[PDB]
Amino acid sequence: TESQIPKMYEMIRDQMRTLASTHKIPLNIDHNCEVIGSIIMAACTNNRDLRPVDKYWFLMGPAGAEVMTEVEIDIQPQLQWAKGAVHDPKYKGQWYPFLALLQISNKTKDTILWQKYPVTQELEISNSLEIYANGHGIKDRLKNSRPRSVGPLVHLLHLKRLQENSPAVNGIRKSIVGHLKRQCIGETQKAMINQFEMGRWESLSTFAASLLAIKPRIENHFVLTYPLIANCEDFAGATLSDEWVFKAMEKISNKKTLRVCGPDEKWISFMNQIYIHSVFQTTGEDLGVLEWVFGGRFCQRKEFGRYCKKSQTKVIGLFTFQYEYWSKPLKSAPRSIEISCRPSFKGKRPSYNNFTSSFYDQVREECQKYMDLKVEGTTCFYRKGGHVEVEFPGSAHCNTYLFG
Amino acid sequence: TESQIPKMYEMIRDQMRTLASTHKIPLNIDHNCEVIGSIIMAACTNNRDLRPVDKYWFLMGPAGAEVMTEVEIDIQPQLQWAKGAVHDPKYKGQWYPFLALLQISNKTKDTILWQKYPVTQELEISNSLEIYANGHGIKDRLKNSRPRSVGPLVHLLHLKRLQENSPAVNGIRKSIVGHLKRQCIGETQKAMINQFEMGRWESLSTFAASLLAIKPRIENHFVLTYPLIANCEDFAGATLSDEWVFKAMEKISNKKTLRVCGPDEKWISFMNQIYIHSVFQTTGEDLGVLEWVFGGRFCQRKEFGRYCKKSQTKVIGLFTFQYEYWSKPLKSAPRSIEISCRPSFKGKRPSYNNFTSSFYDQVREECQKYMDLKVEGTTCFYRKGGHVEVEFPGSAHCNTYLFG
Secondary structure (H helix, E strand, C coil): CCCCHHHHHHHHHHHHHHHHHHCCCCCCEHHHHHHHHHHHHHHHCCCCCCCCEEEEEEEECCCCCCEEEEEEEECHHHHHHHHHCCCCHHHCCCHHHHHHHHHHHHCCHHHHHCCCCHHHHHCCCCHHHHHHCCCCCCCHHHHHHCCCCCCHHHHHHHHHHHHHCCHHHHHHHHHHHHHHHHHCCCHHHHHHHHHHHHCCHHHHHHHHHHHHHCCCCCCCCCCCCHHHHHCCCCCCCCCCCCCHHHHHHHHHHHHCCCEEEECCHHHHHHHHHHHHHHHHCCCCCCHHHHHHHHCCCCCCHHHCCCCCCCCCCEEEEECCCCCCEECCECCCCCCCCCCCCCCCCCCCCCCCCCCCCCHHHHHHHHHHHHHHCCEECCCCEEECCCCCEEECCCCCCCCCCCCC | CHHHHHHHHHHHHHHHHHHHHHCCCCCCEHHHHHHHHHHHHHHHCCCCCCCCEEEEEEEECCCCCCEEEEEEEECHHHHHHHHHCCCCCCCCCCHHHHHHHHHHHHCHHHHHHCCCCHHHHHCCCCHHHHHHCCCCCCCHHHHCCCCCCCCHHHHHHHHHHHHCCCHHHHHHHHHHHHHHHHHCCCHHHHHHHHHHHCCCHHHHHHHHHHHHHCCCCCCCCCCCCHHHHHCCCCCCCCCCCCCHHHHHHHHHHHHCCCEEEECCHHHHHHHHHHHHHHHCCCCCCCHHHHHHHHCCCCCCHHHCCCCCCHHHCEEEEECCCCCCEECCCCCCCCCCCCCCCCCCECCEEECCCCCCCCHHHHHHHHHHHHHCCCCCCCCCEEECCCCCEECCCCCCCCCCCCCC
16 A cells, blocks of 8 residues: 555656656745646546646746746656556556545635535535545546545435435445445444435434534545645655655645735635645644644634635745654544453353343434544554654643644 | 726716706706606617607606606717726626616616516516516616526526527526526526426416416616716715615705605605615615615505606605615625534533424425525624614514505
């Protein structure tokens, strides 16, 4: 799984820099890298969406004199590589999952800046529970490639689309339901997901309430974003389950070669925290946890007004970061609810004893059981510089979230 | 389009004065300006409806001695500019979008004086919901120019007309249906607007019931009327999204040079409020909102009888106006309906909880989402003299309208 990650990141960075440097697009602005990387990812999987030559919003200017304008680029050299890597045997079939992870990681900043809740609204559930709707808008090939990374609400949204309206339909539905059951480890949650499978959305609001109470399994992987990938000069130990990502992106931040854009310079901390969220998928993480891990407060979306249009986004400052603790990406569910003798032997022996002596109701019982869980996570934290086990004790911004 | 607005008022105003000055028509009578402007706006889009020379009811008389008579006017000098401005590159194609804004606002007075409900009656719905039936009687070219300003009911009527009237049908209806969906932000409304697409008008009464609950998005633009345009001598900072319009037409009120016409002098307060109602598109706005915004009580149409004939509309007094607050135009719907953690990070952290644990019904479920809403607007109102955020606190005339 992690064997092809280093060369994957290396060639991603190579194309990242090549497409920008072909037309003198500076890579020290966040918007330039974000747009170019979005074009590259469009080339990666949905090859028919982007254009071989097209104009996009970029920052043209030397030494801080960048102004918004549209620059034509020749994506065909990158298109050829993207289409040729689709079924290259060198990836051992991990090209599609890697691209799914890349798209899921890189489709976050626009959603954060333009606060929208499409999956929950289409599912007619609580909008604040989009926190379980990761992986929306990804390619169907990618969604089957990393369905575990695709959040439970996105899979349930696909199932709802199937119900609202051929063995391919059966295969898609069974994959969706299996991944729903895998992500939602709740037994009552699983049974009511099965109810959704045949179609019973009276528990859909109950599904939202459970997700709020019982937290489904969310698989994750540490994948950097376009600006940091373009600014990353080390990929020797590029794996997905260690501190290599943390150390590399900390070094990138210490380089201080990347500038972020926003409506006004007050958004500098907001963009730094957005970078942190995008790198570590911690958009839904508790703000106290993030403040303790990265040694800095995380500004909520409420602290800032509407994000200005991408046309009028302007450079607002250098990207900065610090952290003191790390951890592996979460594999299983963050919340987990996981004296007598049996003689098979006719002969008399002395005896020895250690001991002297509705469906919605079950769903709410599981909800309260996961309320009884005061600990979150599976194994431990790890301190910066190694894999020494650490545990977060508590913070002022505990129980608070970016959109909470 | 705001940047090009300043040039666009001036050339509208140029032909306003020339038509009246040709036959010595005084411009200090609203009835003279109301008809002359209706002729001027007629040449803008409906070029073949008006006549090159024709007689209309005006007030002829020097210094307050105006007696009503039909006056022939040389409209041919004013005809050429209107058609030339249709595709003049100076507007860069904004002439139709502006003329749709211009045509809608200038027909408000006649509807108020002769209280009729053409859209709701043809839609066989409640007549109290003409607030959402804006944009009726406008040219289809203008209706395709600013369909957003044209209320959904008129589009719904056009949708009903299109079903009760060819590849051109789809093109017109998709704009009709799309702007029905755009204006009515109701998710259940959109599905039941989609029911109206092929003629399932069983929810048409439900739509009226929904309209009482969900207020569809009605885009507003601070467009001036005929008497004020001729009496406005400043257009340098003409913008449709600031207080320039509010400050500009207050100076006209300070001049006290414009006279209003009506059956009798009791309408002087009513006619003054008609100017307030028409300019800011607040005919259906809460009278509690209006009395607070403009610092004056608004007389309802019930306080006055039938309007006198257009052949007997006599001058009743001078136009006066005052205001203390304003707001950015209502771009979205006045009523809008826009807690957990996703740990993507394997660290062992304390679990935190911000909590403890028919299709007509869905429309009614969405209906209750908008009865519960009390605050009206997009962000807030603003005080006179700037864009300082001032929230509407309430008044005695809340939940009361001009026709309420």
